[PDB]
Structures are given as C-alpha cells and as structure tokens.
DNA sequence: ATCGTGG
DNA sequence: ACGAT
DNA sequence: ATCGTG
DNA sequence: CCACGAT
C-alpha cells in the first residue's frame, strides 16, 4: 500500500501514471519550483512553425494546471544555423534576459554538438533538450508529459516524494561508488538521499585512472558529507546506509576498509552520531529474465547476499543483487535491520524523476549511471567540464535528468 | 489442481499424505502386482524382538488395507551371526522356498555389509532392507508406511501415477547422460518414462573410463530404446524429449552432435518416428534459496535457457532447476508452445517419487539416476556383486533402485 | 539402509 | 538430530 | 536528445 | 539503430 505524497498534503497510489497526473491537477507536485524570472526560453530554428506553436501551447497549459508553476511567461529564439557557435549566441541572449531554464529544440541526431551543449547549459541554467526530428512523428501529449517531469525537477521543484514511516529506515542513504568510462579512466560519486527517495547532495570527482580509484572515492565522499552538513547542521544521523554500485576496479577488500575508515573519520569529525549504526552495501544489476506477485519480493541467496526483484503471458523482472558487506549491527537486531535495508532499495527504486514511468531501480544506483552518461560523453566528444563542488545549484539539484 | 491416479478409477489431489493413503485404502493403487508366490520373506536377528513383532504384523495388515494385496503370507528366516556369509545362507533358503520378494532387516549402518548384500538381492529378487537399531514404536507407522511404497514398486506395482492431459507433452522422456563414480570412471544411464511418470525400461552401461563417454552414451540410449520398442512395438512416438543429467564429462558439444545422431539413427531404425518432434534438454539441479506462490514458476532466463522454481517440501526454500534447450527441430511457429508443454512436463515428474509418500520435488528422469549412480558407485567401492539389468527382464522393467 | 531436512 | 499422515 | 522495452 | 507504446 505505498503512495507518493504530492502537494497540499494529498497522496496516490503508486504504480497508476492516470491517477498520478489526476492528482497533480487536483494537488500540485510536492513542491512547486520557485522561480526568480517566471520566464522560460525556448530555442530553436522552425520559427514559424505550426507545431512548435504547439509544442508550446501544450508545455505552457501544462506548466500552469498539472504543476501549478503560474504566470510563466515563454520566449522564443532563433538560431540561424545549427551549429554551436550560431546556437550557442542565442542561448546566451536567452541568459542575459532573465529566464529560468531553457527548452533547447536541436534538428537532428548530432552527439557532439549535443553534448558540447548540454555540457554547456549544465554550467549555466537548467536546460532540457528536444529533438525536432522526433517531435513530428510522436504523439505530443506523452511527449510533453513526461518532458515536464524532468524539467521541472531541473527547477528545482519536486514532483512527488515517497510516503514512507519516519521510525524506519536510514537517516540519510549514500549512494556511492565509480563508473569507468573507457578501461582505464573512471571518476567516483556521492550522492546524500533522504529515505523518501529525495536528493540532498552530491559530488563527483575528476576523471582520474583506476589507479587513483581509492584515494578519489575517500575524498569524494567526505565532500558530499561536509556539504550536506554544512546545509543541514541539525540533521541527526543516527542510522546510515551506503548503497556502493557502478562498473569500478575489482578491489572489494580495500575498498571495504577504506569505506569503513571514512565512517569512523566522519565519526570521529561528530558529522554523524556518536555510535551511528551503519552498514555498507553492494548493490548490482543482474541479468534479467521473464517470469512465463512478485512486486517487493525479497531473495535470500545466503547470509550476507540478497536479491530483489524488481518489476518494470510474460512478466519481466530486473533483478537487483543486494550484498552486506560491512555493518556494526549486533546479532539480534540484524534480520530487522535486512528486512529495513532491503524495503528501503526497494521504496527508493519508486523514485526516479525522469518521467512518469521510469525504470525501476534504486535512484541511488540509477542517478549515478545518469551522471555517468554525460561525464563519458563530454569526455569523449570534449564539451564542458563540468565541476559540481562551489556551485550550489549543481550541488543540490538533479542537472542530470 | 494436479492429482495422482490412483486404483478404480479415482484421482486424489497431490501435496497431501493423508488424503492419498486414505484415497488407497478406499480404491487401491494404480496397479496391484501380480505375485507368483504369493509369499514374502522376512529375514531378521531378533527372533523374540517386540519392534521386529510389531514390524511384521504392520507390514501384514498395511500390505493388505492400503496396498490391496491379499492373503500374501509372511515367512520368517533367522541368522545367527550377524555376517556376510550367516545373511546369506537365510536369502538363500528363503528363496528355494519361492517367495515373491525379500525384506531384510540388517543389525545397524554397515556400509560395506549393506552394499554386498543389497548388490546380491539386486542380482537375485525383489527386495527391501531395514535396520534393527533405527526401528522404535514412535516412528514406525511412518517407517512401515514408506517403507511399502518402495517395496511394492519393486514388486511390479504402480502406486499412482500422474494425471495428464493425453495431447499434450512427451510421447515418451528419455533421462540420460553419465554419473562420474571417482575423477577417471563412471557409467552412462538411459531410462524411458511415460509423460505420467512411470518408468517402463531402463539400461545403465558397464563402468567404463570417461574417454569411453560418447561412445556408452550412444550405445546405452539405443538399448533402452530397443527394449522400450520391442516390448511396446504400437507405442508410436512422435514426440520425444531427452533429459540429459548427471556429473560427467565436459564435452557438451560434442555430446549433443552424439546425441543428434543416435535419434537419427533411431528413426533410421523406426523405432521412433521418421518425423519425430524432439527436444534435448540439459537439467541441472542449481543453488537453493530462499524467498523472504512459486508452485510450478517458470523463468524464462533467453530463448533457450528457462529455470522452474520448485518448492523444497519467515523463509520458504526453493530448490530451482535449471532446464537449457541445446537442440531442438522445432517449428519457430511451435516454439513457444513447445517450450510451455516441456517445462509443465518437467514440473509434473516432479511430483513422481515412488521413494515415498512425500514427493521428492526433483524430477524423477534426474532423481531416479542419481539413485541407480548411489547404488553403481558403492558396490564398486565395496566389492560387490556388479549389477547391470541387460538380459534381465526384471531389472529393465523394474524400478530396484528404490 | 522408511524417507527427507538441517546442521 | 528430527519430523512426517 | 520525453523515456522506456525488445 | 530502429519499431512501438505510454495517461
Ligand atoms: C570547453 As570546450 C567546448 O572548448 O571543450
Ligand atoms: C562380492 As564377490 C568377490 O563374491 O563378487
Ligand atoms: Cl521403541
Ligand atoms: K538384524
Ligand atoms: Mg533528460
Ligand atoms: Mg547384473
Ligand atoms: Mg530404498
């Protein structure tokens, strides 16, 4: 009986796209943005076309009756040519007027300018980008539906938080770990989640070789620690989880005692509680398969090794391999505390805002690889770096959407 | 709403002891056997030994209430010393007196005892062991209980067998494959069920060295099935599914290019069909766990790789069974019908155990050979009798690995 | 070796 | 070692 | 790059 | 890389 609470203090039903949006109508999202221009941009190069003026009458009523953002206010700009020096001018005329994001239409498929682009706007102004090309043949109410979940999210606003019971559960989870992006580079992550699924912080590393792995991941996650405690000095963590995921090098041993060593040393700093009950988790995506009644079920594969199959004739199940590796629990409170972990996996794979039915897969696995996604692309196609640390913007929300 | 067949005409649901020995008493099993002696024989240590009083007196009265076998009588045999060659001379006495089968009480877990005997018996009648020390008024009910389910399939008889749908499934199921006994050796197995469960022959090859694998392999399935056809030459079959099992050389190639080419050699024979519809299926018993429902799942992991959770009779456990499709001659059109009725299949002969009133949730052409591989393996270890069932009627029909 | 687990 | 119908 | 599964 | 679908 999980739901998401919404706005006005209402909540719906998980698992029901039509009630959500109904709700949202009703209620507004959980938390509606607050903007400082009430203007959004949008860029692109069909000036006078007649389903651009569409685009924007559908992404205009949406904004106002289902997210409750009102009185905004939509300018148009034009490029010239699709290139980055001829879009790149009317994006910075767009940011000189005083707008709070940026609804960018490219032509076609082009990943460098793309990603010189988002790599761009990243560092700038909430941006979300769309495909002309595609736009035509869609159907524009699913298009534009999902397009705004994402969006205003990039805002700053929230749609939809988890209901879930304030005794249970870790104070803060960590989403934490490395992604390589070819076979040597890689950079780490740390990403502080509320228990309702929520971001608070999160930081990311420089490109660095495998070599540098362990020295990063330390570093990377007493920065996301020091930020958030810094925004949330009354914050009490007395139960802390970290969730340890992505394609990194195969040093579990060492990485397990440098993860532990960074607890004590945030314990020793009283960033978290006096005797904090923590525990350190790998979490994996598994093969998956089709049964030919499984929502929240839980696998026991041994004492320390756990699987959940998550549910995205046929049934298909991604599974979710959850092992514990580290944890300061003692023996009578550690089959609760699993049943704890492993429902908190489960209510944070609920999560994911990039449109009304995402994958489902723990937000403190899944925001990672999104990073991920433009970190190696920008590398690869060589856009902007993008530096989360000094910007609180990039800090505290989800650019990555 | 699966069901066991039973005698008379009546079915009882599975899942459930109580209903199914009462379901017997009421209607009898499938098939009574057909006695010659109408005699058994108990051999024992204890002549004046209250258990062994009780133990024959409620195998008399369940052998005729539950298993419908009347007015069979029940000799006794004494030995004196609890050895080999004392054992020996009481079987041998009770079978110059003609009896339909043995049941023999040793005096306690005597391995090497055990297997000497049990290969002798196997090589001579019908027979069922017990041991002195394990037998005690609390348990034996459920002792003499189980005890006859075994015995009277080693006897000829059909407990049950299992309810299916006539036009759907295997016309026959072939488990086969090899059993290594140590790093160098071991023998292959061939034996022919029905879809229902029951086995109607069966040939294991002499113990040979793994270099002689494909060779065995072949020749074994061809002997199971030239029994199988000889004494049923009307069984037509046009559909056939292999289950291959059993720890044994990794040759998997190899091993299905072998196993293709003994069908074709087979329909070139006409002991199948020249248009038989086939399946040759890997079964591989895999890591149990436990979920924190899954009655008769099927996974289907790729196309050719499916796992059937079956359950192990807070925490339940699960026992999953891995099942790949290595080759096939199926219809792309039939594929996935095909793929739904083997999978069924495979879950339905979990549910035949003739071990037992309690099924044993492996399917019988896996656990039936991973019986035979027990007995094979340690009579070579102790020096026993050698047992192999070519040219012997009543060890190709009969189930005497029990 | 009543049969199965669980240890 | 236990429990099973 | 609406986001997803095949 | 495309085909089709979602409220
Ligand atoms: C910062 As750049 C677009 O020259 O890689
Ligand atoms: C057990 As022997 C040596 O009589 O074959
Ligand atoms: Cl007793
Ligand atoms: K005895
Ligand atoms: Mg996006
Ligand atoms: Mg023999
Ligand atoms: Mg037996």
Same mark, same amino acid.
């Given at each position: 009986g999980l739901t998401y609470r919404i706005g006005n203090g209402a909540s719906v039903p998980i698992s029901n796209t039509g009630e959500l949006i109904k709700g949202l109508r009703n209620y507004g999202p959980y938390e509606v943005p607050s903007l400082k221009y009430n203007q959004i941009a949008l860029i692109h190069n069909?000036? %006078?076309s007649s389903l651009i003026n569409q685009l924007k009458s559908q992404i205009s009523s949406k904004i106002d009756? &289902? $997210?409750?953002?009102?009185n905004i206010n939509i300018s148009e700009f034009i490029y010239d040519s699709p290139h980055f020096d001829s879009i790149k001018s009317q994006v910075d005329n767009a940011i000189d007027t005083g707008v709070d994001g940026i609804m960018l239409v490219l032509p076609e498929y082009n990943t460098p300018l793309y990603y010189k682009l988002k790599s761009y706007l990243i560092n700038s102004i909430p941006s979300q980008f769309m495909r002309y090309d595609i736009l035509?043949?869609?159907?524009?109410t699913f298009y534009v539906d999902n397009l705004l979940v994402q969006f205003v999210s990039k805002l700053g606003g929230k749609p939809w938080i988890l209901n879930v019971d *304030?005794? !249970?559960?870790?104070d803060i989870i960590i989403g934490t770990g490395a992604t390589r992006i070819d076979n040597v580079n890689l950079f780490c992550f740390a990403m502080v989640f509320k228990?309702?699924?929520?971001?608070?912080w999160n930081e990311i590393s420089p490109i660095v070789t495998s070599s540098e792995y362990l020295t990063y991941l330390k570093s990377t996650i007493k920065k996301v620690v020091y930020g958030f405690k810094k925004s949330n *000095?009354? $914050?009490? &963590?007395?139960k802390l989880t970290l969730h340890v995921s992505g394609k990194? *090098? !195969?040093?579990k041993d060492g990485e397990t005692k440098i993860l532990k060593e960074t607890v004590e040393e945030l314990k020793k700093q009283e960033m &978290?509680?006096?005797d904090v009950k923590y525990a350190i988790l790998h979490l994996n995506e598994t093969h998956p398969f089709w049964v030919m009644p499984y929502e929240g079920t839980k696998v026991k594969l041994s004492s320390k090794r756990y699987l959940l199959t998550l549910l995205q004739m046929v049934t298909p199940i991604k599974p979710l391999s959850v092992e514990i590796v580290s944890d300061n629990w003692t023996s009578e409170e550690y089959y609760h505390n699993v049943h704890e972990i492993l429902d908190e996996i489960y209510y944070l794979? !609920?999560?994911? $805002?990039?449109? %009304?039915?995402?994958?489902?897969?723990?937000v403190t696995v899944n925001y990672p690889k999104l990073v991920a996604g433009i970190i190696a692309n920008v590398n690869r196609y060589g856009g902007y770096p993008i530096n989360p640390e000094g910007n609180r913007s990039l800090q505290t929300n989800p650019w990555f959407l």
């Open positions: 069909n000036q %006078f009756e &289902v $997210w409750h953002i009102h035509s043949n869609r159907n524009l *304030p005794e !249970k559960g870790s228990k309702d699924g929520t971001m608070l *000095p009354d $914050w009490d &963590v007395e990194r *090098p !195969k040093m &978290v509680s006096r794979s !609920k999560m994911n $805002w990039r449109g %009304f039915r995402s994958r489902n897969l723990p």
